[PDB]
Design a protein around this nucleic acid. Structure first.
Lengths: 205, 151, 262, 50
RNA sequence: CGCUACUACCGAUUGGAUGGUUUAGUGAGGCCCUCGGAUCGGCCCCGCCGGGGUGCCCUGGCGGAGCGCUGA
RNA sequence: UGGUGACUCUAGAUAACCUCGGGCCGAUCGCACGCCGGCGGCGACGACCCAUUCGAACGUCUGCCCUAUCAACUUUCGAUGGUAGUCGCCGUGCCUACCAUGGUGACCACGGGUGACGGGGAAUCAGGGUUCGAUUCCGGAGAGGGAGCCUGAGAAACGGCUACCACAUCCAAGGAAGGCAGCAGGCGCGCAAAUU
RNA sequence: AAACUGCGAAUGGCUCAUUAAAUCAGUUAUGGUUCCUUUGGUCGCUCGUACUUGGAUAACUGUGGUAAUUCU
């Protein structure tokens, strides 16, 4: 079927190649796993040596990482916005490695609330939702508030990260191969990487 | 001297560049940590690799390649490819019937890292064997010796 | 092609088995085991070709299936089981124990050992690695994994293990002045004292060895198997003490033995 | 056509050769594993479902 | 230069012979249909008395159907 | 912790994830009769994972016959390289997208021919060579020709399957079944080769 | 005996059609992979009906279809 052999290829000098054998089993290739966004559907393919590969066909959930804070949570994948290989891998919305995706910010935001001791930030319109202000105000002893204050001393979130957190979406990069492991994991874009990919998306649009 | 000249972000995969900093202790770009290794067999890491900024995943000093196998040599003949050059290896092959030799050569396409700048056609380069980096490239330039006929 | 081969042509067999070409087309293809195919000795060769206890492979099968043969203290019923360097073969019914030691001509000698010396063996360690919660491990030429080794044991050293418990009893460091054996190549079977090691990074190291009579030879580091500390061996050497004689002295000794004995 | 009828309650079987089309008409155009009231096969098959 | 011992080239020949050598179309196929799913399956709303932690209700054979729930 | 010439090695630590087609931590057999509602000795068979035991696969450092009445070849179709991916057991234009025009040649590229499988090796000895190697050992390839697969650790397997092409067997004409370049044997081809 | 299960059937044997840096030979590498089996063999390292659980299905018994098969 699909072959990955090099003896069908022209020589370095450009001369033609005459095969000495027909296609072998160990030189095979398989159709791509165009891992779209949808309810989790993963197919298992048996590979050389009896091992198993996880050919993910549909995924909407991934284990992404917030590298600066070292906070990785299970998050929902919302959209793909940039592909460095082909534009059609964004138009058809396939999950491949090193593709830029939109992920939810709710788990990271909630962990940040469990981190929250910062001064007044963006609390203008308020929320007025009871049993949520416990995680921000609470009742706490003196040394617990001292620890929270010493944590606030080293709290610093980039403006781009804030702007993303307002919209409920975060820019992330798929660092795994969904068509080979069945998992769409990665890390949230930060710093110059985030700036570069934001410029890429802006120039594309 | 932009490094990000491709569609994807260029960075060393080992170095984490998103660590939290301190506002009162930061004025200007402080530092970007550089990943480099010393390859074996007594080859010294060039200065431009240690203090450079280029991203080369095939660089023997700042990349993912490991040098193992044959250590060869050759003279640079063509420099018309991105990070890849063509070297020529001349040798004498013995013909037993006539008890004499003949000149023969083979061109090897070897990878040249950006740590070797201003390498000229005719220079003697020491190459080390690595894993297949492309269809024809299997060697990486480890040291560049300036030709005797140079400035 | 298409998966592993299960036969061994008699002329493609290792030459140190001293097989003859007119007996059959095939040689006993040694089974997979702790020793390599080309540097082992199948149990059938030892029991039939060397000890002459059996005339055919069927009789070797009968002997082995009577659970009479013990290799390294374990009963082995496989007639093509690969027994190799320093392996102890104990036959309790006849009350003799053998240690597989190369003779000076590169062949496994029939070297009889006392039952006290049959309770241990020397194993050259091949790699040391740490795994599974910082537990050091040790791999020998015998494919034995020994957990929690002494931190002073490094690669190319030889340990002494008791066969009953399978635990390290002592070890010899790889250093100049230590007695060694050559387990591969032209000098295979020779015994001498290590004099100098030349290190070639990225390539094979070379170890230089001197005999008791001052003959000096060299071989690759992988072929060196240190026997004892200093110039004394920790195991009993064969009838020849590892000295390789030139063909002239071999002929002279043979002629003298022919003359003296009638 | 022949009919191979079995009664699993007793584990008894009997192949009755019938060449009577109007008795077979009740089975036509019906797929396997469908339950058909077989009263047209004979005057003793009343109240039978096969 | 009016005799034969003397296959091929040129054949105003396209008359013939195991002759696949690549365009352009059609087209086999592990059905990898995400449109497909009468069948086959321990509770799912019962027939009813198998019998209990209470000849008195967390029950051990679905007689037996309903694109309602789930399963290859 | 410990290694290598060299790790983005090994080991460790924190935050999490863990597949409809799930994921390892045991629902079973062996004749003797023995111990202060319980314990015990030898085994057999399984099973993740580590150890290159047997390998396989992929890297071309060097070496191969004749031919110029074959001098330029490769690049809608990857040609040489770079970046990111897909696929693959893995490295890799292996494949895709974008980018740069490269890459190979009189030190014979490319093309053609071979009554070319390669090698160990075989036919005279002055020395040097010239021919041969289908053939029992090693490596490769193929099972009428192509192609595609299932199972499996391992096959693109053919004394496995599925098609088409060429032949060809039985048939009640609805259908069914094929692959001796295995051992013997036939026919054919031949100057040329054995016993069902 | 049958039959289910496991394993082997990828070895061996034959032939040399294809194949001209292809195969192959010496050398080296896998720090760029997989590996049934053998041999060592992490195998109470998980912190809220276990005195043994469940659809089945072959062999076997019976009814058959087809001119025909190691069909069913």
């Amino acid at each position: 079927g699909i072959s990955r052999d090099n003896w069908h290829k022209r020589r370095k000098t450009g001369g033609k190649r005459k095969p000495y054998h027909k296609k072998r089993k160990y030189e095979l290739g398989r159709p791509a796993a165009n891992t779209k966004i949808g309810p989790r559907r993963i197919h298992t393919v048996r590979v050389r040596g009896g091992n198993k590969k996880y050919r993910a066909l549909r995924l909407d959930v991934g284990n992404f990482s917030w590298g600066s804070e070292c906070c990785t949570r299970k998050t929902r994948i919302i959209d793909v916005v940039y592909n460095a290989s082909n534009n059609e891998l964004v138009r058809t919305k396939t999950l491949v490695k090193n593709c830029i995706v939109l992920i939810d910010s709710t788990p990271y935001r909630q962990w940040y609330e469990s981190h929250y001791a910062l001064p007044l930030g963006r609390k203008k319109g308020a929320k007025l939702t009871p049993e949520e202000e416990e995680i921000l105000n609470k009742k706490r002893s003196k040394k617990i508030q001292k620890k929270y204050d010493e944590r606030k001393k080293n709290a610093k979130i980039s403006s781009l990260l804030e702007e993303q957190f307002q919209q409920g979406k975060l820019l992330a990069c798929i660092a795994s191969r969904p068509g080979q492991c069945g998992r769409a994991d990665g890390y949230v874009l930060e710093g110059k990487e985030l700036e570069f990919y934001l410029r890429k998306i802006k120039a594309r649009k | 001297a932009d490094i990000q000249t491709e569609r994807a972000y260029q960075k060393q995969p080992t170095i984490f560049q998103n660590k939290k900093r301190v506002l009162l202790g930061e004025t200007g770009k402080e530092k970007l940590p550089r990943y480099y290794k010393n390859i074996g067999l007594g080859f010294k890491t060039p200065k431009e690799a240690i203090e450079g900024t280029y991203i080369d995943k095939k660089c023997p000093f700042t990349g993912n390649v490991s040098i193992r196998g044959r250590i060869l040599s050759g003279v640079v003949t063509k420099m018309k490819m991105q990070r890849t050059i063509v070297i020529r290896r001349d040798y004498l092959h013995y013909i037993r019937k006539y008890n004499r030799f003949e000149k023969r050569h083979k061109n090897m396409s070897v990878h040249l890292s950006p740590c070797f700048r201003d390498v000229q056609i005719g220079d003697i380069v020491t190459v080390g064997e690595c894993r297949p980096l492309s269809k024809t490239v299997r060697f990486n330039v480890l040291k560049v010796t300036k030709a005797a006929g140079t400035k | 092609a298409r998966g592993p081969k299960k036969h061994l042509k008699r002329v493609a067999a290792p030459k140190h088995w001293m097989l003859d070409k007119l007996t059959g087309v095939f040689a006993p293809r040694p089974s997979t085991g702790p020793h390599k195919l080309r540097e082992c000795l199948p149990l059938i060769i030892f029991l039939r070709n060397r000890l002459k206890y059996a005339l055919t492979g069927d009789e070797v099968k009968k002997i082995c299936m009577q659970r009479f043969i013990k290799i390294d203290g374990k009963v082995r019923t496989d007639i093509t089981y690969p027994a190799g360097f320093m392996d102890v073969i104990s036959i309790d019914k006849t009350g003799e124990n053998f240690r597989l030691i190369y003779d000076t001509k590169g062949r496994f000698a029939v070297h009889r050992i006392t039952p006290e010396e049959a309770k241990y063996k020397l194993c050259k360690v091949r790699k040391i690695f740490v795994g599974t919660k910082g537990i050091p491990h040790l791999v020998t030429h015998d494919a034995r994994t020994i957990r929690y080794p002494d931190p002073l044991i490094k690669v190319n050293d030889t340990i002494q293990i008791d066969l009953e418990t399978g635990k390290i009893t002592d070890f010899i460091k790889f250093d100049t002045g230590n007695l060694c054996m050559v387990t591969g190549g032209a000098n295979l079977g020779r015994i001498g004292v290590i004099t100098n090691r030349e290190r070639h990074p990225g390539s094979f190291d070379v170890v230089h060895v001197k005999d008791a009579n001052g003959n000096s030879f060299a071989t690759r580091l992988s072929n060196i198997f240190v026997i004892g500390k200093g110039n004394k061996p920790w195991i009993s050497l064969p009838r020849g003490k590892g000295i390789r004689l030139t063909i002239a002295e071999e002929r002279d000794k043979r002629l003298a033995a022919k003359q003296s004995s009638g | 056509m022949k009919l191979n009828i079995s009664f699993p309650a007793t584990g008894c079987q009997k192949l009755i050769e019938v060449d009577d089309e109007r008795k077979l008409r009740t089975f036509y155009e019906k797929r396997m594993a469908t339950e058909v009231a077989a009263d047209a096969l004979g005057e003793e098959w009343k109240g039978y479902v096969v």
